[PDB]
């Protein structure tokens, strides 16, 4: 089967990942030395197998800079949110940029230590602001409230 | 294709004990004319009764939605019944009152004998119910088997090959994408 043949060589131009040339990459796969796989090299989309010599690009994620990952934030504006599986492979170690990139500048999501923080795609505007404290959390957390129109009846009563 | 033979093959039906009729599971009848008898063959005799004497509206058939074979004999002609050494039929009527059953028998012995199967005892079981690879070359194989099965479970694939399982599973993430649900549920594409 050349499928399997053409695969392993589509693993080698990405366990490569450097632009090595076809000629090379045939002698790196050594036994094959076919050519129908060279007709869905350049056809595969993620492995860009470029005209100009040798040229093994791959895909993925490429934002390998926070620069471009805050375009990475930008371009998701009310659709979804990605993991972080495509920005570990397009950039080695993206969460100790997240923890450089607080504040609303990498709201990851931080799922386990033992998880390493299975980080998210999301990005607010101020995002840490971290000065509150954890007393005033509880006192935020132990006030029930009269609800419907108790409260602004309340409130006439108190001021607003 | 039910039809009618004759209808008219005239018969009798006669009503008898439980001994003789029970037995045949040929005699001569004797016929004097308006009681009539039968020369039983040996052995006693007997007298038969005029049960009814209009029969009509009732009839004798045999047989061979779906439907079967249908066969019309006759019809009835009289109705009897058989009245009956007569005191040993008696004494054999004297001794249907005297059949019974028996007793529960008791085991006799030093008890603790017979008591010893009960809990532990040793003597276990005696009886028969309800007992009850490479990475480029198993890749190989895997196309190979993808060429025959693409949608196909991971369950007879594990049994299929009966290979290195686990380098059989980091083939299947690698070169292979299982589908999760739908029609082809674990299988990989």
């Known amino acids: ?160 | 294709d039910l039809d009618l033979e004759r209808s008219n093959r005239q018969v009798w039906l006669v009503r008898l004990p439980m001994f003789l009729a029970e037995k045949w599971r040929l005699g001569k009848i004797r016929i004097n004319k308006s009681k009539i008898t039968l020369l039983l063959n040996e052995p006693h005799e007997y007298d038969l009764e005029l049960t009814k004497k209009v029969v009509e509206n009732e009839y004798v058939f045999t047989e061979q939605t779906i439907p079967k074979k249908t066969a019309i004999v006759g019809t009835v002609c009289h109705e009897c019944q058989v009245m009956p050494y007569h005191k040993i039929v008696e004494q054999r009527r004297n001794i249907v009152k005297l059949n019974n059953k028996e007793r529960i028998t008791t085991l006799d012995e030093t008890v603790g004998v017979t008591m010893s199967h009960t809990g532990m005892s040793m003597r276990s079981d005696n009886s028969n119910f309800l007992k009850v690879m490479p990475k480029k070359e198993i890749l190989d194989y895997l196309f190979k088997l993808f060429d025959e099965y693409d949608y196909w479970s991971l369950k007879g694939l594990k049994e299929r090959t009966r290979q290195p399982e686990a380098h059989l599973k980091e083939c299947l993430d690698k070169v292979a994408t299982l589908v999760k649900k739908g029609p082809y549920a674990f299988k990989y594409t």
């Open chain 1, 1 to 160: 089967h050349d499928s399997s043949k053409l695969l392993w060589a589509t693993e080698y131009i990405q366990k490569k990942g450097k632009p090595v040339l076809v000629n090379e990459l045939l002698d790196y796969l050594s036994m094959k030395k076919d050519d129908k796989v060279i007709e869905l090299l350049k056809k595969l989309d993620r492995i860009e197998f470029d005209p100009k010599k040798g040229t093994f690009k791959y895909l993925t994620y490429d934002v390998h800079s926070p620069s471009e990952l805050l375009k990475l934030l930008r371009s998701q504006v009310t659709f979804k949110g990605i993991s972080c599986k495509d920005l570990k492979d397009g950039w080695p170690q993206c969460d100790e940029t997240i923890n450089q990139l607080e504040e609303d500048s990498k709201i990851l999501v931080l799922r386990t230590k033992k998880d390493k923080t299975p980080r998210y795609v999301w990005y607010n505007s101020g995002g840490n602001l971290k000065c509150i404290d954890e007393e005033f959390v509880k006192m935020w957390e132990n006030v029930q409230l009269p609800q419907f129109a108790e409260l602004p009846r309340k409130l006439q009563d108190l001021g607003l």
